[PDB]
Amino acid sequence: NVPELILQLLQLEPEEDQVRARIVGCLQEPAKSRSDQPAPFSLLCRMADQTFISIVDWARRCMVFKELEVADQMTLLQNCWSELLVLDHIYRQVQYGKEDSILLVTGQEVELSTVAVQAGSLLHSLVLRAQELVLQLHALQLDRQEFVCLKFLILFSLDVKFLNNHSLVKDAQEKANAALLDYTLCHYPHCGDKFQQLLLCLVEVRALSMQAKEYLYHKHLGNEMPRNNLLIEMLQAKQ
């Protein structure tokens, strides 16, 4: 009753538990986060960097992606890095299920009231917009099967004309769209066009991700980002 592609993707999807353990292990020292109050900008930047590293590791193990040459792999990730990070954050909130706070991959909970106090207008806007998307996805009853399929769809969202291996990626794109459509129609028949609604949510994720890139660019110009930051490397798209 579940498409093969989704069954395979579920087998590659880590437990929110292990990802947390992995990242906290790569992150953690002492000065902020622990203490709570106030909030470490540099630490959160490293946390986001480590989250993307976890995402890259997932991609490397993925069917199809693992068959591509490094050049094609880099091009795909350069096109979807921000969207994968935003979707990751949003799904974490969907499962968290709290409208007055946000859950970080490290397990840290941040009150939205705290964001209103500490964040500038741009970031505050981003956080609030992501929460609106969380509400939409909660109402749509987004489940794990759909989430992993959406991640795969985002990973291969690039037009094949930008890659060396066209046939392989083209088939993956068709398979992913077919799987999400089939799964949603069979498991949520009373949500007429859940498939289309999820695709529209991806349009929203893309718009939000662009705004996130603008936030990062602002930080970059102000020399506020840690040196050798991976997200900034991705923002520069020069690899």
Binding site: I53, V56, D57, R60, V70, Q73, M74, L77, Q78, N228, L230, E233, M234, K238, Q239
Partner: peptide, 12 residues
Amino acid sequence: HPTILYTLLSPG
């Protein structure tokens, strides 16, 4: 052309 991304994908 060494980049962080490249080191993550080229097993090294």
